[PDB]
Design a protein around this ligand. Sequence first.
Ligand SMILES: OC[C@H]1O[C@@H](O)[C@H](O)[C@@H](O)[C@H]1O
Length: 441
Amino acid sequence: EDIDVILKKSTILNLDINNDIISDISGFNSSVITYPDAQLVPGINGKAIHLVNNEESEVIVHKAMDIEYNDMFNNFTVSFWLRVPKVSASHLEQYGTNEYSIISSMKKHSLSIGSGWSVSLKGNNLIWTLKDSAGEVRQITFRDLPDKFNAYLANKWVFITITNDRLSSANLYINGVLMGSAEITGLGAIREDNNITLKLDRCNNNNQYVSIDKFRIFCKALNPKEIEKLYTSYLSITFLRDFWGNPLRYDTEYYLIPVASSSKDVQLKNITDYMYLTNAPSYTNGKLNIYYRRLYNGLKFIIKRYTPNNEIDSFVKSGDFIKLYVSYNNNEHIVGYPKDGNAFNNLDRILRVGYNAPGIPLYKKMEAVKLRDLKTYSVQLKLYDDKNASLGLVGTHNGQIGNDPNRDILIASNWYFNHLKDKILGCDWYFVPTDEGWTND
Ligand SMILES: OC[C@H]1O[C@@H](O)[C@H](O)[C@@H](O)[C@H]1O
């Protein structure tokens, strides 16, 4: 069959946000109740749900009769995009042994004691737990990667999927890749609450928050192929993304980091001069087992709309023509390539910032595109001259200018169009904005 048909046909619950309202679009009409303090924020493909730590911040799903008892004995899969802020080193020391649910089908203020399932967080652990009638429990404890730049519970949108085969195991997938599992034989009936609660439950950190989107339940244990297509079905390729996975926007500051050399920052030699790579400083914590390259150092860039022509959108679409500026000291300096400007061997054109030589054409029309690496939150940039001929993709070239030190210098080159299939490529960029979910320790 199709992966599309069985994904759709096994869907039993599907939360979608339309017209700023949250409802189940599965076909089963489970009623959804949004409390006053459940917030809506930018998501993966539309808006997403945002929960803070108070009793008014919650979204409840009252299961339709027809799907009431679907996970009592049968196989099921839960899927959703998740965004959790990077945990501070102090919060790992304070609340690191504090386990709190964020999504659950279990009861608590009656006397039941939670037969059912739950998605919970505990420091830098993602935990799936299933509990049956007898109080027997099975758990998957996923321990996140220690390098926070590449971790899954460190402020980027990530796609979670947990399948449960009652005859074998429960499997936890992150961005389509199997990352944890537990044998679930020995469990009896799951006799859970009639409501599925999205809420922070028993979290001691008053400032904790999480974002969730596309919460979906399937009536089967999905296989790896189905999971992969499902994951990729949300990655709409028209709207560019920032480093966190949210929509890239015009008129906002972004730090640039080259995807192929993620430990480097971008730096300016000078006004009217060139840009080059530098090593980012990093944070390490042996005791808590966490480390990362620090963010927010090095140049800030702004993307401006190159023309209006009708509808003005605040999001940048692939193919949009733009003007790129370096945002320095409250001033903004255009990035471009002067007519016969310095280049490496008549072909890697050296980019210049705020160049203004009298009488010399300065080419600065760029096109923001998504030409490769779909799952990665990165962007490519193409420069044009005034005959609308391609001057190349923005990348870096190793070399020296005058008597300066050898450096990886920012350039525009048509040479990258011959290598778009490579696994790793020098013309891919991450656009990083400052965010409350990531503060350096
Ligand atoms: O804002 C909407 C966008 O429309 C595109 O046509 C244009 O190339 C962009 O620069 C921007 O204006």
